[PDB]
Design a protein around this ligand. Structure first.
Ligand SMILES: Cc1cc(C)c(NC(=O)Nc2cc3ccccc3cc2C(=O)N[C@H](C(=O)O)[C@@H](C)OC(C)(C)C)c(C)c1
Ligand SMILES: Cc1cc(C)c(NC(=O)Nc2cc3ccccc3cc2C(=O)N[C@H](C(=O)O)[C@@H](C)OC(C)(C)C)c(C)c1
Ligand SMILES: Cc1cc(C)c(NC(=O)Nc2cc3ccccc3cc2C(=O)N[C@H](C(=O)O)[C@@H](C)OC(C)(C)C)c(C)c1
Ligand SMILES: *Cc1c(COP(=O)(O)O)cnc(C)c1O
Ligand SMILES: *Cc1c(COP(=O)(O)O)cnc(C)c1O
Ligand SMILES: CC(=O)N[C@@H]1O[C@H](CO)[C@@H](O)[C@H](O)[C@H]1O
Ligand SMILES: CC(=O)N[C@@H]1O[C@H](CO)[C@@H](O)[C@H](O)[C@H]1O
Ligand SMILES: Cn1c(=O)c2c(ncn2C)n(C)c1=O
Ligand SMILES: Cn1c(=O)c2c(ncn2C)n(C)c1=O
Lengths: 811, 802
């Protein structure tokens, strides 16, 4: 990275200070005598952005000059977090900027903390897109992310009287120094209208128009010359009763990009959401085609622009089914506008698109009513019906007698209200389909889409998820990054598999102590934060037991809560008995319409109030509901964690990525054999994780036999006490019936079988406590996790997409 | 200097626009230049703020719902002395600065004269070194863009901020809360206005450079935003977020009415919004000042603050200041009221009844319950004094009340402004006299010294140096450039009377302007323009009182004369009429359609040819005014006597070498006083003649029957000559002219046409024409807004130019 001492190094810092002062003066228009911390943040942000402009421009020129095949990552979500520190690190500028800011008499941490998260995602899906952008830039791929510039991202969460409340995430209030508005590149998007079938062919007419205006954010590679782009579209009314009302009604078009739908793993079939999906797809495809036509591969024949080489120059990855409309939109452009024959257009379409499936939970599946699609996108409905007809004609030819197979494989679900199965659309319109962990990809291929995989074996793949070690180690845990570098060099950042070199320090007491010291420093720093936000006295010798992720029945924060109450009851039963102290932290947002998740939050805060204030418990056990969990807060809590809770019901968590973050940062994992937890066990050795509970076949057996929650309740005395306390008002004395809905769910409607894993979970937790009392054995197991975490770099993931799906090479 | 401007341009294109030159747009170049120029005033902007903090001059706050600012690039270059160096830098970069200048959107945050006065005043106050800020609303959409479709006005949203605004700086850190609705409790710790809805006011600051000095003042415009904090009093999450639009709608769009009151609740919200944010900001600045430390600190407030109310639109400033002083700062009513009167002054801009702001009490009670209480108390103490002085005069109470009781009760906002201000002024001598001695006679009798005149003015930066550099240069070469800061120096040009070499130079400047504008006209309208024709121009908002219709009758009169005798001598004219109609103003829209209909016939009649062409000049606005005004030979200023409070277009034309045809109305009267009445083409009824015809009764039919030329014109309009596919299209106009014409179009037709004949005669004698032009230009000095501001400063604000 850029030097700070010596002749040149002194000048580097000098220039940065000069640029900072120039921005404060000319850009912010403030004298130092009236400037605030926020002004200083913005002055530094502009200074840092200026430092990547040369590479950003040169990267665009390079892609134009050499025509590498381009990768377009199309997603409704990019969960980017804060940009300042990540950019400084990737540009090799952090040391120099740190020094400049220090010499100016300012506190760099304070400036960095001013920045709002770009919270343009819900959880793992959106964050995967963000990690992927970093990795694709670091590997030199010609890759752009395309999404929506929501005016409001994921809501800011507060807790009031123990319940979640939502506030608007007004992240653009003070502006965004990391985007460049580019209205000259605006493109039209059409809605409603009708289809006309005339002598000149099929026309989509009488439509309403909304403009898509792009905003570009730079995506710097780690220590290279690549600066890629994230292009996010914002909706505007076209410029073309009551004049005043007509002007105000421009708000209706602009509402398309107003707010991120705050649902994680849950389908809500709202018209505004469908508009968002078509909006991002239509603007993105027009932009991609425009760039292709301007490129050196752009050429024209009698029949118009030649698209033969389009899939040799363009790969589009569909992040879940949310941008599934890209398939019929590309066909619409090829057939209605460019006049290609259907067969040729369909062939080009399949070669262009690949689809990533991110969940098998039924409630998450996009099934759009046909009548809604007919109203909003009539031509796309026609095109989808035609795709389905030609799809089913092939199936009839292959399997003349199998009538049910046609029903199973149709893109249309015909019962009651007819709906479009967007996953089926994505499968037939793409050349590759992948899941996000071995266990999940297998379920996708061999169970959920069995009929499709049988006819096209080689279509279905696995690409196990990953995380970027820039944000999720170098940035969030500089202490650990430094320790690792001291022992094995700094080449691990670009090749994370080099972490296996840490195995040379097995049995090295000095290293095991240094590792523990890093964790302790992180815990002390985070404990400062906790004690300023919450009325709690944190026991500094306690095990930090952490479950942070979106609040879900399938992720089973509720199971964790049952264990918290169990520990509480053991303490009250035997005050003098040995207890390994814990700070139990549970955090995450509930989708605002998700009743059971909101009840689970209230249960946790209610339990916390009892546990934290019981003088017989004291420093043995404290419980924190960590508010407003999001990317920047994840960067704080993850490095401070000793035990990572990854306890989804086997078969429900497609991959997980929080699990990987915790593993890389020195926490041990308690979890089920679900998602990538299975592969973490493969890499580190199963005995080096705290694995428990039903596996996917055990869940299947219990489903076959039939799940009777009451049997576990009657059989397990400790469970009985916990449940009776919750049901009878022990945790809600002013409102004894408060948790009725949770009890009813647990006993009669628990699709995720909390009680069935309780016994194994509590036994497993007891083993965790035992190991924690032996620091040498604890930290030895930690070392074995960190040293085996290399597979989970998103650089590895991206190389696999590049080689086996996109057909592009790292550069 | 040139070398560094080029370097700065390139740095902004690279780092600010993030563009390689190989993919740059013309707009990119405009923005790179705009940032380069803005950078040159930042030092003085910051140091001006420091200076006002350090030395504590009394501050002037110009509070207006409108700032009709036009474009900023050229104006800034001129005031900083950078225009010539920028032109050369841009030329060396292979570009044309005039092309870049055309990229900029107008800041069209006004309707017409009232908003443009505020803009001229900001330039003048900065040039004179006054510690002055303009306070208004940052409308997301300004005055609509006007298109003409099938001869009719159509409106398009003025999306002026689409590509950003390089001449503002957002300052969300200085946001302030504004309250609406709610209810009042009169508690033992004071009156509390509670359970209100809150809207945040986010300020955006635009620099206001003085001409060639060290002053850069500020225009601070507020933008509405929804609050974020959760309230325990707090449905669908998505809908709740979308509904933030409702609060943000307050600053969405300028109400596009000129001289017309529309009592919409959203407009009332706009008025309170600008007032509450502005007063809060002024008090914050006051408390932080050296005078903020001190029996109350506010004793010095009116020695440190003047607030000027631009018309009654920010009238709520009076009860708002009382609310803050009494409810928040805990001052006794008597002290608060004393301080309030000494702080505020009010400018009245019209006596037309349809323009008068009268808010229904029930609307104010709902939206601003505490302000209604305060207005009632102001009124009670007001009427108590009147009863004490005139115990037997019951009707005088009715006349002077702030409340009109007749059925639907309403608040007379002008009355509120009068009682709560120490000074009230009209905007030209004729108008200020009517305001004092007729409209508000009851008030002036009790407080004679309260009522003043301040005749309007225009800035000679935008309206001479910028719009007409040839004329500015020519004047400067003869008498130096002291006239820019003291326009009365133009009287020195009188000495060049009889200098035929100079008169030819003057004529050549006009001719160059005409050729350039002819190119614009041929580009935009594809009509062939006769270079030797008199450019006869009426540009201003479309109004019955401004009488574009009367002009149209003269146009048709000329057409008919040509068709009746094609061999006869005819002095050729290009007749240009332009202006926007308020969208709800039916008659204005009919008048536009009549003009475009007449134009279509006149322009395409082969018997007429190059003798006469007619243009409806589309999308009239500040930047287009700068193009047409310098190209004008004859300026039309033909409002009915007593209806135009002042006018300012009239002054612009006079400064730029046009002769004026007009009535003795508004400032036209003072233009005649300065230049000599014989050097204007004055015609028609005077204010006393209009009163006499009102007394007698106006019967339009009598003029129609007595004047053969009028009859022909009217019958043609009436019977479909100008609308053959829609013979009765103009029925509404005809009905109005005969039975409901409050502005007496026919009554001035004869004098108007006879006057127009004299203009044509003079235009055939270039020496005599240009002699009269010189006498107009040389007598235009009074109409500098620098003169106007000096008088406000001395006689109203009590501040000294610096
Ligand atoms: C309208 C405006 C214009 C400019 C150029 C600035 N930037 C700026 O540096 N202004 C100031 C510089 C100062 C330097 C030395 C001493 C005092 C200075 C004051 C300002 C300045 O504009 N003061 C501000 C003002 O007068 O509105 C704010 C910060 O002060 C209050 C909160 C009390 C109202 C600011 C902050 C506002
Ligand atoms: C996303 C983005 C990023 C950057 C850094 C820029 N700015 C910029 O200068 N870009 C380019 C520079 C080039 C220099 C030499 C040769 C080619 C260059 C191309 C670009 C560039 O980004 N080209 C743009 C693009 O690829 O989207 C536009 C202008 O081209 C199309 C309209 C055809 C799509 C632009 C304009 C867009
Ligand atoms: C034959 C002829 C030639 C030309 C060039 C013109 N154009 C024109 O406007 N010419 C003049 C411009 C002047 C400008 C300022 C001062 C004096 C000017 C004089 C003329 C000019 O040519 N004057 C002529 C002359 O002196 O004979 C005629 C037009 O003037 C009278 C009608 C009074 C006889 C005209 C109008 C006629
Ligand atoms: C990584 C991350 C997630 C994904 O976590 P899982 O435990 O895999 O569900 C969700 N939210 C945030 C803020 C994250 O950083
Ligand atoms: C100066 C001006 C006005 C005022 O013109 P009047 O003829 O005095 O009514 C109105 N609109 C614009 C754009 C102006 O420049
Ligand atoms: C639909 C959706 O958000 N799915 C989520 O996707 C992420 C990223 O692949 C997975 O890690 C996670 O297990 C899964 O729940
Ligand atoms: C209410 C309103 O806009 N009034 C206008 O104000 C301007 C500026 O004072 C005058 O010149 C003009 O005659 C008058 O019509
Ligand atoms: C029942 N339900 C919801 O209602 C819901 C949800 N996520 C958001 N919402 C509204 N999930 C995951 C869910 O299971
Ligand atoms: C009747 N009327 C209007 O209706 C109107 C207007 N200005 C705007 N509107 C709507 N004027 C001046 C007017 O006289």
């Amino acid at each position: 990275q850029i030097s700070i001492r010596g002749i040149v190094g002194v000048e580097n810092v000098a220039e940065l200070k000069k640029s900072f002062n120039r921005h404060l003066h000319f850009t912010l228009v403030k004298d130092r005598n009236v400037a605030t911390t926020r002004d200083y943040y913005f002055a530094l942000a502009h200074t840092v952005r200026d430092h990547l402009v040369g590479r950003w421009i040169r990267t665009q020129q390079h892609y134009y000059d050499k025509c590498p095949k381009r990768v377009y990552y199309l997603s409704l979500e990019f969960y980017m977090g804060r940009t300042l520190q990540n950019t400084m690190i990737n540009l090799g500028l952090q040391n120099a900027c740190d020094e400049a800011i220090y010499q100016l008499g300012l506190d760099i941490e304070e400036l960095e903390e001013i920045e709002e998260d770009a919270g343009l995602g819900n959880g793992g899906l959106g964050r995967l897109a963000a990690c992927f952008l970093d990795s694709m830039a670091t590997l030199g791929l010609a890759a752009y992310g395309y999404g929506i510039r929501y005016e409001y991202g994921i809501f800011n969460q507060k807790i009031r009287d123990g319940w979640q409340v939502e506030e608007a995430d007004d992240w653009l209030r003070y502006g965004n120094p990391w985007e460049k508005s580019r209205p000259e590149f605006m493109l039209p998007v059409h809605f409603y209208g009708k289809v006309e079938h005339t002598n000149t062919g099929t026309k989509w007419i009488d439509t309403q128009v909304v403009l898509a205006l792009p905003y570009d954010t730079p995506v710097p590679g780690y220590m290279n010359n690549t600066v890629n782009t994230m292009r996010l579209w914002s909706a505007r009314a076209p410029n073309d009763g009551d004049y005043i009302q007509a002007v105000l009604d421009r708000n209706l078009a602009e509402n398309i990009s107003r707010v991120l739908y705050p649902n994680d793993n849950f389908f809500e079939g709202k018209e505004l959401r469908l508009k968002q999906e078509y909006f991002v797809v239509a603007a993105t495809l027009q932009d991609i085609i425009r760039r292709f036509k301007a490129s050196k591969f752009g050429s024209t024949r009698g029949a118009g622009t030649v698209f033969d080489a389009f899939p040799d120059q363009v790969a589009i990855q569909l992040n879940d089914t949310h941008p599934a409309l890209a398939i019929p939109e590309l066909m619409r452009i090829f057939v209605d506008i460019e006049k290609l024959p259907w067969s040729k257009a369909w062939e080009l379409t399949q070669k262009t698109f690949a689809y990533t499936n991110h969940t098998v939970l039924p409630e998450a599946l996009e099934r759009w009513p046909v009548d809604l699609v007919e109203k909003l996108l009539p031509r796309h409905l026609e095109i989808i019906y035609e795709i389905n007809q030609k799809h089913l004609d092939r199936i009839v030819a292959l399997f003349p007698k199998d009538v049910d197979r046609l029903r199973r494989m149709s893109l249309i679900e015909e019962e009651g209200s007819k709906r479009i199965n967007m996953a089926h659309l994505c499968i037939v319109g793409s050349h590759a389909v992948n899941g996000v962990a071995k266990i999940h990809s297998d379920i996708v291929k061999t169970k959920v889409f069995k009929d499709f995989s049988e006819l096209e074996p080689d279509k279905f793949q696995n690409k196990t998820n990953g995380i970027t070690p820039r944000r999720w180690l170098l940035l969030c845990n500089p202490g650990l990054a430094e320790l690792i570098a001291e022992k094995i060099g700094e080449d691990y950042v670009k090749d994370l598999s080099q972490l296996t070199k840490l195995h040379s320090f097995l049995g090295d007491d000095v290293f095991l102590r240094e590792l523990a010291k890093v964790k302790q420093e992180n815990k002390l720093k985070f404990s400062q934060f906790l004690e300023t936000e919450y009325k709690v006295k944190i026991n500094p010798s306690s095990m930090f037991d952490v479950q942070v992720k979106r609040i879900h029945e399938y992720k089973r924060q509720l199971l964790n809560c049952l264990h918290v109450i169990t520990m509480y009851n053991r303490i009250k039963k035997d005050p003098k008995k040995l207890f390994v102290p814990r700070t139990v932290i549970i955090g995450g947002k509930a989708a605002p319409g998700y009743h059971m998740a909101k009840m689970i939050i209230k249960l946790i805060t209610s339990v916390a109030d009892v546990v934290n204030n019981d003088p017989m418990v004291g420093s043995k056990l404290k419980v924190i509901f960590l508010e407003n969990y999001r990317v920047s807060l994840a960067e704080k809590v993850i490095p401070a964690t000793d035990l990572s809770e990854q306890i989804s019901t086997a078969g429900t968590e497609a991959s997980g990525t929080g699990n990987m973050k915790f593993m890389l940062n020195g926490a041990l994992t308690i979890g089920t054999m679900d998602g990538a937890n299975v592969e973490m066990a493969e890499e580190a050795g199963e005995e080096n994780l705290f694995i428990f509970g039903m596996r996917i076949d055990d869940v299947a057996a219990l489903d076959k036999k039939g799940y009777e929650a009451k049997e576990y309740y009657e059989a397990l005395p400790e469970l009985k006490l916990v449940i009776d306390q919750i049901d009878n008002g022990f945790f809600s004395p002013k409102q004894p019936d408060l948790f009725k809905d949770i009890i009813n769910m647990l006993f009669y409607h628990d699709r995720f079988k909390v009680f069935a894993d309780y016994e194994a979970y509590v036994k497993c937790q007891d083993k965790v406590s035992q190991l924690y009392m032996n620091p040498k054995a604890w930290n030895t197991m930690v070392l074995k996790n960190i040293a085996a975490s290399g597979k989970f770099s998103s650089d590895r993931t991206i190389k696999e997409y590049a080689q086996n799906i996109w057909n592009v090479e790292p550069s």
